[PDB]
């Protein structure tokens, strides 16, 4: 049996709402965790864009013009794939920032709903605590009136033995006046318990719904943040496959690089002559 | 076909075949330098990228999270520093390859300068003796022309002239003929000395060409290997990163949403029973 929020965050203290305060603090801790995940993506995207842009500049500004044939094509193949890798990491930064934007939208979505429950809970809890203070004030008054009624009845019983008719009439109207005061204090006390009980069940119902809603928010936040870590690790691991495939293109170009072919291609293109100069002989002026 | 067989000049005073090969070595030296600059700038970029990844991992937050999701987020920061540290090590590996290429480059330049000194020596002597031999030819021809003019002058007056005036003109013709004969010997010896250096140069040119072909074969081999090694080291970095990111996925597989919620409840629960309702308390009961 999976334990729920609504069943494990109550307080035996009637005037305490610690169970709600603990859950509300957990949502604030999760909100900061969502921001920390967003902060890592933003800084990683900035680093990836800067790294990609630097690779593009190195490839475009690099030399190699003096080389010819295979070695030139191989070196140009490395510069071409370097720009492709750098441009891919620039696109990775845009992908990470899209994950950054999605989390901030989800984060602000939960805050909008959380504020609604906060207003509802703060209302019913304030009314519950207010009526509780009223009920206890009614109880203290009700109990004091009962003591006054018993004291007024004991005073009547005391003087109704050998006392005069004038002093007895005064004491009997005092006992009836105090007995009526105790009856009205009981009705006010009974009505205070009735109003307090009404709000109590309302609060218990409202607290039970808020707990299930906060559990739904936490379940969604934990799921999306777990998915964000899995997607982020996949997008970085996918970048390793894309880069490795691009660097393989350089090796494919190098397979067509023959040392003997480049030397023969340079000879056939820059050869000046296949015969050494003829020796200078003696030239007779008359022969 | 080889360098020694395809870089001659029929022009005796021209050494273009040697100049073309020497220019090819200078172009190959710049190609080696351009490969060094690519490694130097890539290593600088990797060190900057690696150091930045480490700073992001160390400065990142996540303290408010607990249980699996915290361990997963801490696993991402841990592997991020490992990736950044690995890219820092990649820069040292690239710079070591950079140092190897510049060392190889200066080895060839030292040997190339030696052959340049030898060729510049024998070529300067070959051109020097050729210029001397042609100066000897011009003198020899001028002496022959002077000798023919002195003999034709004798033939002119040797018809009805006196014995004294004929002897005077014939002694001039013999004086000019002797000058042409000794000028011919100087011209002959100039051809002998020139031929000596010529054969010396042809052998020296053949040795220098064969050496330059070996240097290009070595340079093309090391640069071809340097490109293959560079592509492997970059591809190896992709494998190391994927293995590190794999550690994050393995941690995420042990991340259960329901486990984190139940673990939070068992640690922060305040009570399992709602407060008791406040009842009416009779003063007499």
């Amino acid at each position: 049996p999976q334990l729920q929020f609504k069943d494990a965050f109550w307080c035996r203290d009637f005037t305490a709402h610690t169970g709600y305060e603990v859950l509300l603090q957990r949502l604030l801790d999760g909100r900061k965790m969502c921001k920390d995940m967003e902060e890592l993506l933003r800084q990683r995207a900035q680093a990836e864009e800067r790294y990609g842009k630097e690779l593009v500049q190195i490839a475009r500004k690099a030399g190699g013009q003096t080389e010819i044939n295979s070695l030139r094509a191989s070196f140009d193949s490395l510069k071409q794939q370097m720009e492709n890798v750098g441009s891919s990491h620039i696109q990775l930064a845009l992908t990470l920032r899209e994950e950054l934007r999605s989390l901030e939208e989800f984060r602000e979505r939960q805050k909008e709903q959380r504020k609604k429950y906060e207003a509802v809970m703060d209302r019913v809890q304030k009314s519950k605590l207010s009526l509780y203070k009223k009920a206890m004030e009614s109880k203290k008054t009700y109990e004091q009136k009962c003591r006054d009624a018993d004291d007024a009845e004991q005073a009547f019983e005391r003087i109704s033995a050998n006392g005069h008719q004038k002093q007895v009439e005064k004491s009997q109207n005092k006992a009836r006046q105090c007995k009526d005061s105790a009856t009205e204090a009981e009705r006010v006390y009974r009505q205070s318990i009735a109003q307090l009980e009404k709000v109590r069940a309302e609060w218990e119902q409202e607290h039970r719904t808020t707990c299930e809603a906060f559990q739904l928010q936490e379940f969604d936040r934990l799921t999306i943040l777990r998915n964000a870590l899995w997607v982020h690790s996949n997008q970085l691991s996918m970048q390793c496959v894309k880069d490795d495939e691009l660097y393989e293109e350089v090796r494919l170009t190098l397979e067509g690089c023959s040392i003997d072919a480049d030397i023969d291609s340079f000879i056939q293109a820059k050869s000046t002559g296949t015969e050494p100069p003829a020796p200078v002989p003696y030239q007779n002026y008359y022969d | 076909l080889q360098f020694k067989d395809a870089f001659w000049c029929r022009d005796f005073t021209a050494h273009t075949g040697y100049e073309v090969l020497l220019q090819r070595l200078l172009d190959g030296r710049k190609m080696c330098k351009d490969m060094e600059e690519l490694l130097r700038q890539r290593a600088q970029a990797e060190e900057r990228y690696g150091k930045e990844l480490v700073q992001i991992a160390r400065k990142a937050g996540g303290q408010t999270e607990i249980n699996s999701l915290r361990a997963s987020f801490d696993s991402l920061k841990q592997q991020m520093e490992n990736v950044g540290s690995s890219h820092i090590q990649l820069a040292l590996t690239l710079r070591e390859e950079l140092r190897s290429l510049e060392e190889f480059r200066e080895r060839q330049k030292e040997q190339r300068k030696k052959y340049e000194a030898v060729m510049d020596r024998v070529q300067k002597s070959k051109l020097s003796l050729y210029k001397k031999a042609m100066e000897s030819k011009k003198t020899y021809e001028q002496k022959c022309r002077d000798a023919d003019d002195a003999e034709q002058a004798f033939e002119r007056i040797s018809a009805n002239g006196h014995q004294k005036q004929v002897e005077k003109s014939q002694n001039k013709a013999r004086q000019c003929k002797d000058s042409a004969t000794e000028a011919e010997r100087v011209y002959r010896q100039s051809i002998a000395q020139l031929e000596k250096v010529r054969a010396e140069w042809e052998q020296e040119h053949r040795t220098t060409c064969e050496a330059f072909q070996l240097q290009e074969f070595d340079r093309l081999t090391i640069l071809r290997n340097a490109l293959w090694v560079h592509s492997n080291q970059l591809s190896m970095q992709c494998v190391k990163d994927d293995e590190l990111y794999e550690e994050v996925r393995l941690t995420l597989e042990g991340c259960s949403i329901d486990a984190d919620i139940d673990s939070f409840i068992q640690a922060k629960s305040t009570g399992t029973e709602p407060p008791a309702p406040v009842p009416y308390q009779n003063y007499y009961d």
Binding site: S237, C240, V241, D243, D244, E245, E248, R251, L254, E255 | T221, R224, N225, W228, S231, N232, Q233, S235, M236, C238, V239, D242
Partner: peptide, 14 residues
């Protein structure tokens, strides 16, 4: 999913 990685040079080299 997983990178191919480095590869030995052609065996006809060197």
């Amino acid at each position: 999913s997983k990178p191919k990685g480095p590869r030995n040079p052609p065996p006809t080299w060197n």
